[PDB]
Design a protein around this nucleic acid. Structure first.
Ligand SMILES: Nc1ccn([C@H]2C[C@H](O)[C@@H](COP(=O)(O)OP(=O)(O)OP(=O)(O)O)O2)c(=O)n1
Ligand SMILES: [Mg+2]
Ligand code: NA
Ligand SMILES: [Zn+2]
Lengths: 243, 142, 94, 47, 8, 1111, 325
DNA sequence: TATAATGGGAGCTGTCACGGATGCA
DNA sequence: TGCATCCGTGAGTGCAG
């Protein structure tokens, strides 16, 4: 439709109808919108937040997100201990909030042991808009980003958000930890330079303590003996660091 | 922007991928026809083999856009740009996409031919010595 | 980082071959109940529950440690596939 | 067997017919009362 | 070029 | 507390009524308040006058009237109606042959009405009609981008009221003309106007360059009506050139003031441009048998004299604000009205020549619907009818003053280049240069300057004082861009003795370039600095110390200020905080002098001196468009004596009548152990304690019960398989009780729908066979609450049909709405911002024992991080703290006028005076200097903040005036090695809270054709893993993780189901099969007659449909 | 990696506690307007009418005037920018702006100059510069008119980051499409062809050879693989060897000495691997500073590596890149 | 199912840049 | 034959919508 001549419009609107080629092609077409990348299950989004207490390979996943993104795993575990008899009743527990009992969460913490999730940030410009983290569960809603990896993501905390995706297979785990964990990707693949490096506060800190005072009092006198220079200094006429 | 020359080369190398014929020697090609530098070098061996004349060819420099569109894999090209022009010319020629690249296999959804999916590494086996010798000894005598 | 990774990449010829050896061994374990492990009980990865310390469930952490011992063999074209998926269901049942 | 290539080519009229399970004869969708598909139109179940 | 003016 | 002002600028006039561009506009189009006789031919009227009278029988227009609305403003908000008035129009039919006279007043529909503040109500949601900017009607010349010495001339009417035309003088000497992109020699056209060879040189007669080239007598050898038919062939390749059809086509394009209208503007602009009076808004006339040109030769006169070099012939700058103009709301809708009217006229004449040409009235010759529909359209799907922004009251006011370049009539995003978006010279004091959005709409959507107004022609004009001699008159006049350019105009703050220009160098603009000029040469003077910026921008204190690119964020970010339950006006104000609460029409004032009768959380009644007893009721806890509690609170007490215009209740985000966008807090500016990192923010738990930054929010949860082809849906308390605990808050009918607590999972309204032809299948008919209950025939469709939502049921609305007053969309029995509330404490993730563009997320809430604190025990509230300031370049927030320090200890607030505020000395003065209170209180209360305050002072001396060899008091004094104080870390008692900046800041809670954005799904809805997961928090989405994310995984080489994304996590229906079964069974997930969306790709290529084919390595097909599409 | 991981958290922990206690802040008084200023401000008007007078007496034209009006004001800005850092380093070496810009924690001289010095010349919509600069600082405060003039600049700059962004994206996407099938498919293609990476730049300043800038040489050499032997300064770099970062620095030295002019390297410009590239012709997997592992999608890495910077390329700018690709 | 009736009607407007196929001194 | 000139095609990510 519309390729040749006027386009076929339903009545009372001017919207060209969507013809077979229009489906196939375009940024909105079948290829670019459903074959070269879909939507996905086991994924979440939230506001990020700096956690400077994290180790390089970690992140702050709020526990309400955690539950869902692992909901199958949590149903099976919920049996193997027995916070429910079978998995179907296990699900009906977590479907209203009240019904979540404490040892549900202790149950979860078993679930996610060892395995990582993925963080994704807004424009995935390079291989590093996605990196792997062991989640540590937390209360509150916000994701905790490690400060060193903010650079690759170009993530400040003006209110940016991030995506979470759970890998599933024992293969998709072994891919995330070996190849895509933050702590293993420290040099840029473009320049080969380091990319997890110190930035704003971290170098502000180490500068301030490795800088050296340069005092202007003594102005560089010529004293032939220590014993008197000291004397001069306890006289108050020459500052400690003046050269 | 410190950025390794090799990346830019990788690309440029794909801009240079193609060549124009300038005398078809003893081949089915045609003066002006374009084709991958690879595929002409390819049969210019089958022709130095049957000892006949070789294709005369000529280097071609294409921009990146035109070079993606001219790829072999019509599944890659249709999913990039100029979707019909690609799609028709492919169906006329009854092209078959070999599924050599990434896009191709991403649209089908198969394990891409890179990383954990490279044939170099995907067929690797692992056995504990307490099982590599458990199967090696029943199978030493018929 | 991952504990011991730097030496892992040393063993294999290409980082991705580690990843599949790990993931494969790491599923050999998930299906067999770990009976085939080539660890001893004190090297056993262990997680800490609210009740008490127990075997690490993450079959991948296992597989990695498992690999560092040297007690595993990796490589291409080493067995018939069907002669392993049974001899191992034999030595350690499902 | 396992997919390994993907061929694209013109469908002959007889081939188009090969695929088809019935001539859509009527420009009808679905019955304004039973909200079920009119037979011989675009949603017919015998096709 | 315009399918009415043609029939007209 | 005291309110100390600064500022030397005696502003002459005040801000004008800030919604006049919305209200003045619509009213000057309705006239519903003018006796029809006294109406004037603009707006709703002029449209009638244009389409009428209808022609062969004839039907002529007498007058229209408007009736009051069938329901009051609030009644429509509830009942999802429109706030509209019935439109009657009196007509008289008269017979083209006999003298017939009938006269009915036929009803045309409902015209929607605009409320007091500038908004509309349309199916019960407030909306705004954003004025639109567009190139204005008129005739222009602009050089040809090809031939550097020849210049296109162009002729442009109002949108869709005539065609564009260019007069490019070709490279072949004789001058061309383009209409519907159809070029041809201009000459042929001048002929048709009755033009003669001689009277061209008799009018051109100077430029033998082309004047003599324009003439080519393969044309002159024809009478006027001869070329008339000549050209009908040139634009209609095929139509029979009858001398009835050609006079009709031309006319219907160039002389028919019914589809060719230059603006009322277009007239004047082309008039003064070509310096000719213009009978009507039309290029040509039909008068006394033939065509009498009006505009073509004058235009042709300019163009020629320019392409030689004549004086007074300048190209025009189409981005000047004299050549652009504003289609205000009233004009925008009469456009849509003039298109409904013209459609109704296709519907009369149709029934004027088929059906009975004598037994006819106006009543039955008019189908009101073509009108009713174009109006319903304008307000319900225009680009320019936007959901109102009533986040806080500033948001609604800033909205009404928006200016879009986009929309029907203007620019398609792709059509938008650079010149449209740039700040033009002539924006000065008409359109704000700050207030605009970051992103793709930058420079298209903008804001009205604060003193600026739109004249009757649609141009923006701004005020200026007239200076004579060198004394400055109190007589103000508003100029259009064009006349401004005529004068030398002194700067807002050029200094004066009394009212004489007291300097000898005065800072002035001549056509927007800055010139230094003596007070002899000075004609006008800016009214104020407030006149150059948005309203919002005028809310930024210390603006002149704020780089522009963050002024803009602090500007926009205000309209996102959630209204806080303890809101307070900023300690440092700019002087508008009061008008804004006024014109926002959200606070509530005193109509005349009087005394106060009663007072109450619900109403405020006041006896007046007129004896009248008005009873202002209080809009208490009303849910805004954006969910933000729009709450009116009372500010007087019984018997209070109130002069006129005093206050009687604070609106939301107003404190005693001042715009309270957020709270004033004790802020320390110092890195804090990582929780400052990259604009993150650390806050004192003592904030949630005193309920600072708390806000109330509401969501509507609506449900219908409808008649079905399987039974009726029922709103019952009787839901199958549900435990009483799971209903302990529902009333008899199935409604939660007003005042319950509801959380995720909880039923809000039980409901039952009937099961289908899957009425229990065997598997199920048996499971019940064991349990003694047989299969039940209805279904739980109860409206639960969504994940991560909830609160306290505050109201319910139940509308059935069969009840009075009520009738809902067909087939729906009953519709129940339950409004839920929440008190939102501040929590870790919410966004805070200040008026200077410092924005950040709350990353950490320390308990007060960890907050840095002053010697005298007081803990700070906010620790911002100094790394924000340097690269950001927004220094105002630095000064705003310092003057906040002083205020904090004097107990004062300040009014620092933009660009004319308190300067550094005036303020370091105020800090001294505070120091006295903070320390002199001390060295008398029995304590001296402290041992840590010295160790810090030791350091300050190495830095250079203090003069060495001075009493500690002397030095602490010196640090203070630098706005710096000693700070003890609460984790150690040890002092901060340095002296810190600590002060009082205005900081809003933004609308973007973690609560509204945390979301996650394991598995949920899928899409009909693709079987890929739905998208969006509200659908219970999946996260779109895009081309760019796939690349990412690709570059890592995570084939299995990517494949997963592309099969079991999205649409590999087989392995997807297979997986989730594998997890709950404790098994590893299964290797996947072909995604379903690829199958759709196959079938969709068959439907295009292409035979796609999966093949194995030996080239024989492979059925990815497992035989289900073979026979 | 494992240790650098622990190293990295380490530098994170202490650097973070230190920043807080040390007590860095910002008060208005910390943008120190160097007194050298009005020496330089005054010295300007005199030299301004010293060219408003080689025109006031019609000496040379308006198109000559404006040209030298802003050759003056540009080298005025430079002067007072320096004065702001001399005044810092000699007198307040620990003032927070100085400290922040100096370590690389924030700021650069040019912004900082606007806090303390003067704002500078501003842009006019067209693209031309106002001959009237804004002499105010941000500490000092801008005149309304000053503020306005300064606005054409930023608006024209926002618009830019918005249209630009769409081309980087689009460009990046073409790049991925034309390279996605490139993977490191085999170990050695046995190719015996390579490329000379010139360490010397055929100048026209002296139109001699000037050694090439270090980083640009690092750019063409780091993590390559030699395809012939090299022997420079008693060292033997063998055929086959992956130039480590130090390998590179040694080759610059030997070039500074005259023993070498162009290293022969195995580039992918010449791998004969079909549909991919060998390990050798590639080189290091820069993310690991070691030989690339067979199966890396280096094409996709390339595309990502080249796209990601254009945002972020201010003109020619990114245009010129697109004109070449 | 019968007076007679015999060629339409709205266009829409301010982007851009490249590459390929068609027309013309 | 060389070069106007027209027609068709593109024009960043995700999220709220
Ligand atoms: N249309 C958009 C809007 C935003 N971004 C991303 C890119 C960046 O992550 C951030 C824009 O950078 P900023 O201007 O917000 O500030 P930076 O933190 O990147 O630089 P600085 O630290 O000086 O503020 O938002 C993007 O890619 N495309
Ligand atoms: Mg950000
Ligand atoms: Na930032
Ligand atoms: Zn090679």
């Amino acid at each position: 439709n519309g390729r040749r001549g006027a386009p076929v419009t339903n009545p009372g609107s001017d919207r060209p109808l969507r013809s077979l080629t229009d489906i196939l092609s375009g940024k909105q077409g079948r290829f670019r919108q459903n074959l070269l990348g879909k939507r996905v299950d086991y994924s979440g989004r939230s506001v990020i937040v700096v956690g400077p207490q994290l180790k390089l390979h970690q992140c702050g996943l709020p526990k309400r997100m955690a539950l869902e993104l692992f909901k199958p795993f949590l149903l099976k575990k919920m049996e193997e201990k027995g916070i429910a008899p079978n998995v179907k009743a296990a699900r009906r527990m977590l479907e209203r909030q009240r019904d979540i009992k404490d040892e549900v969460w202790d149950a979860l913490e078993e679930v996610i042991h060892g395995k990582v999730v993925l963080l994704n940030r807004a424009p995935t410009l390079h291989r590093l808009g996605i990196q792997a983290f062991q989640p540590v569960l937390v209360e509150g809603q916000s994701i905790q980003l490690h400060p060193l990896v903010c650079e690759a993501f170009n993530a400040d905390f003006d209110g940016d958000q991030m995506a979470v995706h759970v890998p599933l297979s024992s293969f998709a785990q072994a891919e995330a930890r070996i190849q895509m964990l933050s702590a293993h990707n420290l040099l840029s693949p473009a320049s080969g330079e380091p990319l997890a490096k110190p930035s704003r506060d971290i170098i502000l800190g180490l500068y301030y303590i490795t800088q050296v005072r340069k005092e202007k009092k003594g102005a560089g006198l010529e004293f032939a003996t220590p014993e008197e220079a000291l004397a001069a200094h306890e006289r108050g006429e020459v500052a400690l660091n003046a050269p | 922007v410190k950025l390794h020359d090799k990346h830019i080369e990788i690309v440029v190398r794909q801009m240079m991928k193609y060549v124009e014929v300038t005398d078809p020697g003893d081949s089915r090609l045609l003066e002006g026809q374009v084709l991958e530098k690879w595929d002409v070098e390819a049969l210019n061996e089958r022709l130095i083999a049957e000892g006949k004349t070789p294709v005369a060819w000529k280097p071609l420099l294409m921009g990146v856009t035109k070079s993606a569109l001219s790829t072999k894999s019509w599944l890659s090209a249709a999913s990039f740009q100029n979707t019909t022009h690609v799609l028709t010319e492919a169906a006329i020629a009854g092209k078959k996409d070999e599924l050599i690249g990434l896009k191709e296999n991403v649209i089908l959804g198969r394990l891409i031919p890179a990383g954990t999916g490279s044939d170099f590494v995907r067929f690797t086996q692992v056995v504990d010595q307490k099982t590599l010798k458990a199967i090696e000894e029943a199978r030493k005598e018929a | 980082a991952e504990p011991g990774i730097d030496k892992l990449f040393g063993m294999v010829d290409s980082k991705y071959r580690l990843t599949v050896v790990v993931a494969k061994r790491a599923q050999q374990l998930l299906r067999h109940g770990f009976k085939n492990t080539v660890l001893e009980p004190e090297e056993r990865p262990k997680m800490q529950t609210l009740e008490g310390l127990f075997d690490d469930p993450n079959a991948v952490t296992w597989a990695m440690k498992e690999l560092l011992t040297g007690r595993l063999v990796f490589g291409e074209n080493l067995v018939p596939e069907d002669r392993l998926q049974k001899e191992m269901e034999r030595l350690y049942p499902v | 067997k396992e997919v390994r290539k993907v061929r694209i080519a013109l469908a002959s009229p007889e081939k188009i017919r090969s695929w088809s399970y019935g001539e859509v004869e009527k420009p009808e969708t679905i019955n304004y009362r039973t909200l079920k598909p009119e037979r011989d139109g675009l949603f017919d179940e015998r096709i | 070029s315009d399918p009415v003016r043609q029939y007209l | 507390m005291e309110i100390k002002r600064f500022g030397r600028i005696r502003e002459v006039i005040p801000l004008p009524p800030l919604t006049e561009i919305q209200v003045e506009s619509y009213r000057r189009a309705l006239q519903a308040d003018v006796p029809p006789e006294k109406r004037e031919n603009v707006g709703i009227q002029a449209a009638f006058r244009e389409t009428f009278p209808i022609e062969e029988l004839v039907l002529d227009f007498l007058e229209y009237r408007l009736g009051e609305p069938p329901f009051p403003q609030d009644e429509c908000r509830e009942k999802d109606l429109t706030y509209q008035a019935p439109l009657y129009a009196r007509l008289q039919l008269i017979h083209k042959d006999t003298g017939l006279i009938k006269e009915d007043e036929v009803f045309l529909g409902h015209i929607p009405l605009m409320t007091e503040d500038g908004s509309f109500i349309i199916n019960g949601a407030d909306r705004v009609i954003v004025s639109q900017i567009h190139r204005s009607p008129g005739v222009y010349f602009t050089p040809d981008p090809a031939r550097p010495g020849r210049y296109i001339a162009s002729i442009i009417p109002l949108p869709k009221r005539g065609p564009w035309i260019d007069l490019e003088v070709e490279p072949n000497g004789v001058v061309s003309m383009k209409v519907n992109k159809r070029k041809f020699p201009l000459v042929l056209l001048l002929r048709v106007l009755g033009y003669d060879q001689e009277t061209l040189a008799r009018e051109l007669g100077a430029y033998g360059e082309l004047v003599q080239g324009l003439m080519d007598e393969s044309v002159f050898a024809m009478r006027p009506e001869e070329a008339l038919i000549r050209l009908f062939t040139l634009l209609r390749p095929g139509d029979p050139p009858k001398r009835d059809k050609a006079v009709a086509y031309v006319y219907g394009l160039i002389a028919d003031p019914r589809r060719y209208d230059l603006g009322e503007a277009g007239r004047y602009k082309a008039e003064e441009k070509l310096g000719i009076r213009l009978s009507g808004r039309t290029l040509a006339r039909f008068e006394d048998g033939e065509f009498k040109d009006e505009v073509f030769l004058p235009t042709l006169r300019y163009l020629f004299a320019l392409t030689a070099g004549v004086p007074g012939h300048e190209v025009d700058d189409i981005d000047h604000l004299g050549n652009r103009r504003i289609r205000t709301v009233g004009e925008l809708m009469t456009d849509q009205f003039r298109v409904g009217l013209a459609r109704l006229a296709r519907g009369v004449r149709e029934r004027m020549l088929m059906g009975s040409e004598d037994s006819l009235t106006p009543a039955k010759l008019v189908n009101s619907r073509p009108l009713e529909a174009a109006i319903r359209e304008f307000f319900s799907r225009s680009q320019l009818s936007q959901f109102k922004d009533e986040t806080n009251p500033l948001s609604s006011l800033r909205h009404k003053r928006r200016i879009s370049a986009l929309g029907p009539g203007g620019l398609t995003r792709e059509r938008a280049g650079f010149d449209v978006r740039d700040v033009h010279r002539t924006h000065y004091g008409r359109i704000c240069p700050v207030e605009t959005p970051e992103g793709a709409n930058i420079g298209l959507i903008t804001s009205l300057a604060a003193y600026a107004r739109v004249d009757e022609l649609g141009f923006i004009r701004t005020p200026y004082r007239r200076v004579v001699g060198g004394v400055v008159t109190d007589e103000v006049v508003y100029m259009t861009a064009t006349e401004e350019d005529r004068y030398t105009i002194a700067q807002a703050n050029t200094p004066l003795e009394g009212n004489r220009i007291a300097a000898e160098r005065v800072v002035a603009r001549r056509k927007g370039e800055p010139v230094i000029v003596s007070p002899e040469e000075v004609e006008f003077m800016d009214v104020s600095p407030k006149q150059v910026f948005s309203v919002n921008t005028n809310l930024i204190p210390f603006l002149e110390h704020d780089d522009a690119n963050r002024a803009l964020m602090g500007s926009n970010m205000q309209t996102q200020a959630v209204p806080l339950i303890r809101a307070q006006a900023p300690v440092v104000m700019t002087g508008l905080e009061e008008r804004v609460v006024r014109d926002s029409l959200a606070a509530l004032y005193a109509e005349e002098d009087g005394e106060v009768a009663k007072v109450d959380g619900n109403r405020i009644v006041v006896r007046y001196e007129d004896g009248r007893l008005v009873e202002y009721p209080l809009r208490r806890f009303y849910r805004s468009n954006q969910g933000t509690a729009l709450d009116q609170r009372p500010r007087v007490v019984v018997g209070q004596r109130v002069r006129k215009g005093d206050l009687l209740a604070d609106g939301p985000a107003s404190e005693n009548g001042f715009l309270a966008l957020g709270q004033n807090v004790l802020v320390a500016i110092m890195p804090f152990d990582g929780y400052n990192f990259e604009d993150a923010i650390v806050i004192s738990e003592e904030l949630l304690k005193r309920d600072f930054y708390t806000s109330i929010h509401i969501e509507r949860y609506e449900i219908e019960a409808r008649d079905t082809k399987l039974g009726p849906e029922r709103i019952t308390r009787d839901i199958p398989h549900l435990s009483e605990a799971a209903l302990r808050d529902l009333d008899e009918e199935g409604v939660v009780r007003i005042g319950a607590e509801v959380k995720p999972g909880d039923i809000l309204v039980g409901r039952t729908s009937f099961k289908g032809e899957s009425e229990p299948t065997p598997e199920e008919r048996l499971l019940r066979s064991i349990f003694g209950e047989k299969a039940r025939d209805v279904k739980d469709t109860s409206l639960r609450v969504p994940p991560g939502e909830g609160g306290i049921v505050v109201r319910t609305v139940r509308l059935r049909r069969g009840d009075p007053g009520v009738e809902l969309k067909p087939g729906v029995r009953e519709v129940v709405r339950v409004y839920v509330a929440q008190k939102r404490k501040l929590q870790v993730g919410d966004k805070l911002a200040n008026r200077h563009g410092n924005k950040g997320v709350v990353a950490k809430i320390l308990p007060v024992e960890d907050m840095p604190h002053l010697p005298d025990g007081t803990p700070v509230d906010v620790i911002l991080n100094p790394l924000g300031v340097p690269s950001r370049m927004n220094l105002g927030q630095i000064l705003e703290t310092h003057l906040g320090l002083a205020g904090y200890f004097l107990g004062q607030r300040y009014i620092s006028p933009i660009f004319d505020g308190a300067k550094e000395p005036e303020i370091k003065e105020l800090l001294a005076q505070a120091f006295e209170v903070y320390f002199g209180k001390r060295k008398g209360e029995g304590f001296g200097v402290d041992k840590r305050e010295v160790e810090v002072l030791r350091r300050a001396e190495k830095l250079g903040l203090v003069t060495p060899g001075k009493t500690p008091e002397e030095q602490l004094k010196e640090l203070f005036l630098q706005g710096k104080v000693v700070l003890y870390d609460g984790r150690t008692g040890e002092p901060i090695e340095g002296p810190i900046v600590v002060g009082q800041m205005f900081i809003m809670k933004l609308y973007h809270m973690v609560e509204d954005k945390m979301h996650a799904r394991s598995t949920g809805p899928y899409s009909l054709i693709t079987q890929q997961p739905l998208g969006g928090k509200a659908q219970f989405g999946g996260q779109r893993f895009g081309e760019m994310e796939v690349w990412a995984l690709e570059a890592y080489g995570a084939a299995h993780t990517l494949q997963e994304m592309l099969t079991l996590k999205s649409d590999d229906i087989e392995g997807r189901n297979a997986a989730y079964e594998a997890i709950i069974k404790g098994e590893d997930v299964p290797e996947p099969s072909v995604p379903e969306s690829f199958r759709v790709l196959v079938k969709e290529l068959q439907a295009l007659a292409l035979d796609v084919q999966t093949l194995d390595e030996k080239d024989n097909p492979v059925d990815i449909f497992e035989g289900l599409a073979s026979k | 990696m494992e240790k650098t991981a622990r190293l990295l958290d380490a530098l994170k922990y202490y650097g973070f506690t230190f920043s807080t206690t040390s007590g860095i802040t910002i008060g208005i008084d910390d943008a120190v307007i160097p007194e050298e200023k009005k020496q330089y401000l005054e010295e300007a008007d005199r030299k301004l009418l010293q060219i408003e007078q080689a025109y006031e007496m019609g000496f040379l034209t308006d198109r000559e005037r404006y040209d030298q009006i802003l050759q003056l004001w540009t080298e005025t800005t430079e002067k007072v920018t320096q004065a702001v850092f001399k005044n810092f380093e000699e007198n307040y070496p620990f003032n927070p702006l100085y400290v922040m810009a100096q370590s690389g924690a924030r700021g650069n001289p040019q912004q900082i100059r606007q806090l303390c010095g003067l704002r500078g010349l501003m842009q006019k919509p067209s693209g031309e510069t106002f001959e009237v600069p804004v002499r105010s600082s941000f500490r000092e405060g801008l005149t309304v008119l000053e503020y306005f003039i300064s606005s054409h600049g930023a608006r024209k700059g926002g618009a830019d980051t918005a249209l630009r962004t769409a081309d980087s994206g689009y460009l990046t996407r073409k790049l991925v499409d034309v390279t996605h099938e490139i993977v490191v498919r085999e170990a050695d293609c046995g190719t015996t062809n390579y490329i000379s990476v010139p360490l010397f730049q055929p100048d026209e300043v002296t139109r001699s050879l000037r050694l090439r800038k270090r980083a640009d040489i690092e750019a063409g050499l780091y993590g390559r693989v030699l395809a012939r032997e090299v022997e420079v300064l008693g060292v033997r770099l063998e055929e086959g060897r992956y130039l480590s970062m130090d390998d590179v620095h040694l080759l610059i030295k030997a070039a500074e000495a005259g023993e070498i002019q162009e290293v022969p390297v195995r580039s992918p410009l010449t791998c004969q691997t079909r549909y991919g590239v060998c390990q050798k012709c590639y080189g290091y997997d820069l993310s690991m500073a070691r030989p690339v592992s067979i199966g890396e999608a280096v094409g996709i890495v390339a595309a990502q590596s080249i796209g990601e910077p254009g945002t972020q390329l201010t003109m020619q700018g990114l245009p010129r890149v697109i004109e070449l690709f």
